[PDB]
Amino acid sequence: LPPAPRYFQGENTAGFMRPVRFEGDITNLEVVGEIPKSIEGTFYRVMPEPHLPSFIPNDPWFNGDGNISGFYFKDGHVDLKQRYVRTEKFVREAEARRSLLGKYRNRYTDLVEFKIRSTANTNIVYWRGQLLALKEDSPPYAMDPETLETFGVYDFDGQLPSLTFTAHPKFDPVTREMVCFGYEAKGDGTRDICYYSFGPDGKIAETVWLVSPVCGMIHDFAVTENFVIFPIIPLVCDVERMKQGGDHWQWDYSIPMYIGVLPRRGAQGSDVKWFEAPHGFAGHVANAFEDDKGHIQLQMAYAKDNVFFWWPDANGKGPRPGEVEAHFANFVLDYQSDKLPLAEPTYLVDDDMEFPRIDDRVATRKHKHTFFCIFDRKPGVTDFEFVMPRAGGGAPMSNGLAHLNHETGDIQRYLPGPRKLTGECIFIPRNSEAAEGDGYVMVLLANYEDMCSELAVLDTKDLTNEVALIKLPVRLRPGLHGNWVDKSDVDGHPAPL
C-alpha cells in the first residue's frame, strides 16, 4: 500500500493549519470582558481536521475529517465540548491507524471499498433534537446535541430519497420546514438533482427530481415563499476522468453560471427553468425573497473567475492564490420570463466578502441585515509579514466582519486586529422580542500571535467592540460552517418575525 506518514507534512497542515485532533472538554473557559448573562444556548461549528496523515500529498482542506465544537453558554459562563464525527471513514481509519480514503470525492483512489465517503465536515445543523453533520456527497450523520455522540448515518426514518444531502438546507421560519436538496443524486457524475423538504413533524413533503444542464457543483441554494433556486458553479465532473485517478472537479470557461428556478410546491422536473447568468463562481447565498412584483431577489457572493483555483480547467488554466475576489451580488430572476440570459448583477458593497449570515427569522422573506466575512487588503489591517509564515495554506482568509443595513446602507466593520483572522459568524437574537438583526454576533478568531483560538462576542448596537473575548488555550483549526441553537427555542430554530 502507499506509505502512511507518521507526522503531517505540507503547507496544508503547517503552522496554524497543523491538526490538533483533540476530543473532549474544556469547561469554564477564560473570559476577558463579560458575556451577557441573558445569552443561553450553544454555538456549534465544524472544522475539517485530518485524524491521520493522508497518503495523498497536499490533500485539500475540504477532505479532512469533521470535528464538531460546541460552545455551551449559560449565565455568562461557557464550556467547550469537542468531538469527531464517527463517519465510516473515521472509524475504519482509526481501526487501521492509517489513512484509507484517497482523493476528494474519488472512490477509485480509495484503498478499501467505502459504502459512505462522508467526512461530515462542512456544516452542523439542528433538526428535531439531533445535530446533522453535513457533507454534500453523502447523507447527514446524526449526533447528540448534548454529548456530541455520533448516532450514525441518518435517513429520516427511511424517507431520504437521494444519495446526497446538501450542506446548506434552509429553515423556513413560518412553515418550520427544512428545505433540502442533493446534486449528483444518483451517484458520481449524475446530473440528477433531488429537491425535497421535511415538515416540522419529520414527514417528507416535497420530492422532485430534475436534471442539471451539466454535472456541475451546486454547493448552496436559495428558497423563497414560492420558489427554490439552484446556482451552479462551473466546476464540472467527468466520471471517466475520475476512473483514471483524476479530479472530481474541473473548471469550464465555456458555460454560464446556470441558475435554476423551480416552483417550491407541487412541481415536476420539467418545470425547472435554467437561467444563464454571466459566467462566474456561485458563492454562498445570504438569502433570497420575492419582492412586491413577484420577482426573485437572490443575494449571494459572486466572483468572476474560479475561487477553487486548485481545480483548474482542462488545460490547467486558472487563477492564483488570493487573486480572485467575491462580491455581494443581487441577481433578479422572473420565473415567468422566457429570456434565459440574465443581466450582470448589482453589487451591494465593494468589499471582498464571503460567509454571509442573516437573521434567520426572516429566511425566505425580505431581509434587511446581512453579516459577512471580509478580506480587506488595505495596508495594515492584516500584518501579512507576520501572519503568512505562521498560517499555512488551503483555507480562506477573512480579517473582519461587516454588518450591512440594507435600508440605511450603513456598514459597520469589526476588525479583530492585525494578527488575527476570523471564521464564519453567527447571529443571536437579543431575546424573542428583538428587532431584525438586533442581538449578539459570535465569531471564532485565529490569533497568530498566541497560536490560539478565541471566541469573540459582539453586540450589534456596536459591532466594532468586543463585549467579551473567550480565550481558548488550544487551536481550533480554521473551519467551515456553524450555527446557534438557542435554549428558548423548542425546535432549535428562532421564531418568525
The binding site for Fe cation consists of 168, 219, 284, 481
Nearest distance, CB of residue 388 and its own copies, angstroms? 18
Alpha helices in 61-124 (DSSP H): 88-96
Nearest distance, CB of residue 81 and its own copies, angstroms? 9
What is the widest separation between alpha-carbon atoms in the chain?
62
User: What residue type is 267 in one-letter code?
Assistant: A
| C-alpha cell recorded at residue 121 | 465536515
C-beta closer to its own copies: residue 97 or 203: 97
| 155 binds its own copies per the rule CB under 8 A | no
Among the residue ranges 18-26, 103-111, 199-207, 344-352, the one whose residues contact its own copies (CB under 8 A): 18-26
Which contacts of 308-311 are long-range, i.e. CB under 8 A and separated by 24 or more positions?
Answer: 308/233, 308/235, 308/249, 308/251, 308/281, 310/60, 311/235, 311/247, 311/249, 311/250, 311/251
Cα–Cα distance for residue pair 419/195, rounded to 1 Å:
43
User: What binding mask, one character per residue, do residues 457-476 give for its own copies by CB under 8 A, x or -?
Assistant: --------------x-xxx-
Nearest distance, CB of residue 311 and its own copies, angstroms? 29
| 6 binds its own copies per the rule CB under 8 A | yes
Among the residue ranges 5-13, 132-140, 202-210, 258-266, the one whose residues contact its own copies (CB under 8 A): 5-13
Task: Judge contact between 401 and 373, C-beta under 8 A.
Answer: yes
Q: Of 211, 340, 435, 451, which lies in the binding site for its own copies, with binding defined by CB under 8 A?
A: 451
C-beta closer to its own copies: residue 435 or 474: 474
Query: CA 18 → CA 82, 129, 476, distances in Å?
Result: 17, 33, 10
Residue 358 phi/psi, 5° resolution? -120, 180
| 8 binds its own copies per the rule CB under 8 A | yes
| 51 binds its own copies per the rule CB under 8 A | yes
User: What binding mask, one character per residue, do residues 63-102 give for its own copies by CB under 8 A, x or -?
Assistant: --------------x----x-----------x--x-----
C-beta closer to its own copies: residue 53 or 318: 53
Cα–Cα distance for residue pair 23/80, rounded to 1 Å:
10
Cα–Cα distance for residue pair 119/110, rounded to 1 Å:
14
Nearest distance, CB of residue 80 and its own copies, angstroms? 9
Nearest distance, CB of residue 38 and its own copies, angstroms? 17
Burial of residue 437 (CB within 10 Å: 0-12, 13-18, 19+) is buried
Nearest distance, CB of residue 62 and its own copies, angstroms? 21
C-beta closer to its own copies: residue 83 or 420: 83
Give Cβ neighbours of residue 338 (< 8 Å, ≥ 6 apart).
Answer: none
What is the residue-wise DSSP string for 174-201? TT-PEEEEEESTTSTT--EEEEEEE-TT
| 408 binds its own copies per the rule CB under 8 A | no
Task: Judge contact between 122 and 480, C-beta under 8 A.
Answer: yes
Nearest distance, CB of residue 358 and its own copies, angstroms? 32
C-beta closer to its own copies: residue 8 or 274: 8
Task: Judge contact between 182 and 165, C-beta under 8 A.
Answer: yes
| 497 binds its own copies per the rule CB under 8 A | no
Nearest distance, CB of residue 8 and its own copies, angstroms? 6
Among the residue ranges 20-28, 225-233, 325-333, 383-391, the one whose residues contact its own copies (CB under 8 A): 20-28
C-beta closer to its own copies: residue 21 or 279: 21
Cα–Cα distance for residue pair 393/15, rounded to 1 Å:
9
Q: Of 10, 14, 22, 330, which lies in the binding site for its own copies, with binding defined by CB under 8 A?
A: 22
| 389 binds its own copies per the rule CB under 8 A | no
Cα–Cα distance for residue pair 434/58, rounded to 1 Å:
46
Residues that bind its own copies (CB under 8 A): 6-8, 18-28, 30-32, 51-53, 77, 82, 94, 97, 451, 471, 473-475
